A = this chain, B = another copy of it.
Amino acid sequence: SVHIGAEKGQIADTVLLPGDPLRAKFIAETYLENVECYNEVRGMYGFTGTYKGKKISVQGTGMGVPSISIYVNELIQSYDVQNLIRVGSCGAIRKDVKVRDVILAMTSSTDSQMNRVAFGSVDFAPCADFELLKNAYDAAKDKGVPVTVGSVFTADQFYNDDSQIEKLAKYGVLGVEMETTALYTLAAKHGRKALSILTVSDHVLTGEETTAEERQTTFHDMIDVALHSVS
């Protein structure tokens, strides 16, 4: 594949997809055994190791629809990946979305043109694979991890002068990140299973930051949910 330097069999059936390739490294080293780095192209690291004797890969995606779309397309088309799970963060856009909440996205809205390019007059609603989502939901509930299931907004512009998050929040949308629409659309288009699990890095409308301790905790809950869900 053009952007991933792996050899056949080096990538697992199940790939976790953080945005930050240094977080991919952190996840692999902290959570998995017998880790190998199968990719260094562009410094977008990918790794494979085991969790409870089961192979799992962790691949950085970069930020934004166009970057994740590259990695997801290649993982699917060249490495026959079956389960793709984004583990990232988002900016919460409602007060009722708590800093400790782990978010499982059922769907995502977007201002990316990717789906209008394919469908024109149709609004395509991307959809999480329900089996992955329900497993993740059960795993959170079992351990008492606070979890909220709803939708997010996949944004093209981190700094958007024409942001509609205020209106999106009133329509129930939970938070804003930069990947989910692409992940969910591309996995579905190829008959694979996808889910995004997100932590809250801040409230964008109040500007209130989540603390370092808060972030470390929710991140560990996200990774546990991601792995527990698939064991």
How far is B134's CA from A189's CA once the two chains are assembled, in angstroms? 25
Q: Is A37 an interface residue (CB 8 A)?
A: no
Query: Would you call A118 and B63 a contact (CB within 8 A)?
Result: no
How far is B66's CA from A157's CA once the two chains are assembled, in angstroms? 6
How far is B157's CA from A122's CA once the two chains are assembled, in angstroms? 12
**Would you list which residues of chain A between 184 and 208 have a CB under 8 Å from chain B?**
185, 188-189, 191
Q: A22-B42, A113-B111, A122-B110 are in contact. Are A130 and B156 (CB under 8 A)?
A: no
Query: Would you call B66 and A178 a contact (CB within 8 A)?
Result: yes
Q: Is A115 an interface residue (CB 8 A)?
A: yes
**Would you list which residues of chain A between 120 and 136 have a CB under 8 Å from chain B?**
120-128, 130, 134
- Partner-binding segment picked from A28-36, A48-56, A159-167: A159-167
Interface of A, secondary structure class, is: mixed
- Partner-binding segment picked from A9-17, A67-75, A79-87: A67-75
Query: Would you call B64 and A66 a contact (CB within 8 A)?
Result: yes
Q: A62-B62, A66-B178 are in contact. Are A124 and B171 (CB under 8 A)?
A: yes
Query: Would you call B116 and A121 a contact (CB within 8 A)?
Result: yes
Q: Is A65 an interface residue (CB 8 A)?
A: yes
In the complex, 11 of the A-B residue pairs with CB atoms within 8 angstroms, ordered by the A residue number, are: A22-B43, A64-B64, A65-B66, A66-B66, A69-B158, A111-B121, A111-B123, A112-B156, A117-B160, A124-B168, A171-B189
